[model samples]
Target: ASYAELFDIGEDFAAFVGHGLATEQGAVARFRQKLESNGLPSALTERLQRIERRYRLLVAGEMWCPDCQINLAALDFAQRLQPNIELAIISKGRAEDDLRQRLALERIAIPLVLVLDEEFNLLGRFVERPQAVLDGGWFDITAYLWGGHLEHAIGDVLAIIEGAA
Candidate 1:
């Protein structure tokens, strides 16, 4: 069986995640508007706005995942607002060894968004579709899948960047 068959991600999943569809586009536009209206926290807003250098966003995910589709759309929308964002999709199952090495886990999880610096160090992750949240809240799952409360995740990544400085 092909990878798509094994993952149950043939036409439908691709159609969902492949390109930003009409609904995805609309949802993303709304998401961006909400972010701009509320405004990111001062520290984060400064960091995000000051990001003139290109940064790589690695999405380790399976296309068959619901959270992956949702989060991917959100990231795609965010990229539109921030032109410096560069995205690369890596299949979790295909990159299992590398991901396990980096995360120090035995398995790969879908929808793992790893923000890497120019030097390619692990900054932070927006991990979704997991069985449990490390902090024991509805925030991660709900926000990742339904689009709210993303500042924490984004802030964590920026915090990492600040720490490195």
Candidate 2:
């Protein structure tokens, strides 16, 4: 119920990006261009199109974070390709209180994506970064720009969807 309320109060991608610092705005544009050039994988595209259920992606992030720039842009692309998937953006400030207690998030983490069903039931979540980065303990900016981790992020979200089913 709290998450549903948060999702309801969240901003659309455009509105969220409009609050970005100029450099952050540029970063988002750059990431989009990179994703466009690299393109989403064919298999992933097929899988996304196959989803029949409505899913809401509630993202807690700030525009200035590089992870948010890359991941959110990729998510926006996924939302475009999959009509059943909805995306909402909430600033970390707005989600901090609830998330801290409920999720036991020790610190603020941007792009904490909550995957919810049509009834706003939480199915799963994609934390700050993909599994690879979490395991490796470092982020590869180049890999991020080339759509590698973006694919990983999307795949992780898809796993949540598939698992819920």
Candidate 3:
């Protein structure tokens, strides 16, 4: 029932981006733009550099998903900024087939990030969107494309990562 079984079921960031390029260029553009334009805060950068433990961010998402484009990009950004962090992406179908029951959820949300420690122990999961979006109950994909919420997602994710440490 643990997420350890999914350690090898995901693709690297480049492969995942290629998947998006083949199916949806626009989504790929968004993903790439987020990567290029977004800047990590100095404080978070220091924290990321201070991380001595390795962590694996296992994601269940597809290139076609806008949420994945935004949040997954943010996760990958952190991965690059922190040597101790790694990111991998699995398709939604694969995630649904393997994780729904284990997670006790009705559906497998895209960009579901299962944070794992060095040995693949599940630390926590950051689902679909950030708490801000969930609490707001209103989301505008285009608005997010302009930036702001990705930081929120990153903060929440780092909270889990730091909390585990």
Candidate 4:
């Protein structure tokens, strides 16, 4: 199956873009508070601090994708957390093409967040559609984008960094 097959492009795309812009705005406010509050675990905090300026994030998505919207919001949150985490958007079809060659898979999914170290090696990915409540208003999308399994996946990346450092 193709990336298109995995997601509803028309409806989800609109939702994604709308949610991304809204989340980006709200993240600016919440991020600083979260960083200072010390509510997050020390291990996670340390790992986040360690990779603050050490990695680049490539967001594989298209304007007409719902997953792209969610991933973009997540990337925005990551950016707020770490100012140096660079972001680049690659269209869905192109992203799939690249993944097929890189991962040697016939099909690739959307919203594939490719984390890379300073040297650009494949660190890991947060792929597939993020879980969000359509009825929960805009913030719901933000929650889904920034709160899902991706956070745990990123935590894994941080763990590796902490171990190496």
Candidate 5:
């Protein structure tokens, strides 16, 4: 099937991040730090952590991507916090053609987070990074270092998914 050809890149969430080991050169360390930090408010936290419907975050990203250096780690943390949220990584480095043709990506960008229901139905996505971060210009030095801006975007993404649910 089309999904099989396009996919088979990452069978699961953990495998994809493990394969990276390339986020700013220390994915494992960054993942640990991300898990150590949780800034989601109690309301949203519970909403994501306890969501009843099944969901999958299929992310097309690369190890060397500039944004992935920061975003992936936080995303891994988000997956951990939400029991039903499974993030499957699809490496653009490995399957560019499949992504461009199948995802219908006009620009073929990296870190395109495709939100899908358990049945593989498309729900929504976070491209490059979340809209909130992009809108806030969190790429600035201090906010990037503090982790707050990234968390804010993650929370925003959670809100979107919850709304869809």
Candidate 6:
């Protein structure tokens, strides 16, 4: 779909959270609990305050996505703090065929977030989860064992957003 299509189908953070919380089940309760319980950490709050450019943050996600549940609020809260950012949630299914194919090429997973600079130029992408956590190779174990790893996810995501700007 055109970038224009995304906004039409997209939801803001609040809508995502409501539907996200309602649709969860099985092991997803932990994700919901984490999202509902976790407050924004200062590092992310500060970084967002420091951003200088506006970025169109288009997220390819579903309410059930574990990464989405864990990370969306941080992005949501950041947008609230910064006039330079706009966050839009585009469900993977609602996204156009070309968008899906693009993901298939990289074997990308959700939440597949793409950042556009102030001019709508593509800045960067965070495929599936933040790369730092995946690179650490311990996200699964740590998230399961402690779950405090979500704090790390906020910084990791901030890095991508910052670089894109």
Cα error of candidate 6 at position 117, Å:
1.6
lDDT of 6 by residue, 101-147 (tens): 65455344777777776666666677765555676755564653345
Candidate order by TM-score, decreasing, is 2, 3, 5, 6, 1, 4
Tens-digit lDDT track for model 4 on 81-150? Answer: 7766655555567656556776665776766666666666666665654332434567765655554433
| Candidate 3 segments whose C-alpha is farther than 4 A from its true place | 1-5, 22-26, 137-142
Backbone clashes (count) for model 5: 0
lDDT of 5 by residue, 8-72 (tens): 45656455555564544574466447557655567766766667777777777776675665666
lDDT of 4 at 135: 46
RMSD of each: 6.8, 1.9, 2.4, 9.0, 3.1, 3.7
State the TM-score for model 5: 0.76
Give candidate 6's whole-model lDDT: 0.64
Cα distance off (Å), candidate 5, residue 50: 3.2
TM-score versus the correct structure, for each prediction: 0.62, 0.91, 0.85, 0.54, 0.76, 0.73
- lDDT per residue for candidate 2 within 1-165, as digits (tens), equals 387788888888888889999998988888778668888889888888889999999899998788898888878878877879888888788677677777777777888999999998889988888777677633564566455687778878888998996
In terms of lDDT, model 1 sits at: 0.57
Residue-level lDDT of model 1, residues 1-165, one tens digit each, is 322222332222234354656665565456556666775677766777777766666766655566565556545545555768655676767557456764776776677776766666666666763334346576766665555655554555445555654
Q: What residue runs in model 1 are displaced by over 4 Å at the alpha carbon?
A: 1-16, 19-43, 129-134, 138-144
The model with the greatest lDDT is 2
Index of the highest-TM-score prediction: 2
lDDT of 3 by residue, 8-65 (tens): 7578887878766655656656665765676767886777777788888888888877
TM-score preference between candidates 1 and 2, better one: 2
Residue 18, candidate 1: Cα error in Å is: 2.1
TM-score of candidate 1 versus the correct structure, residues matched by position: 0.62
- Candidate 3: pairs in clash: none
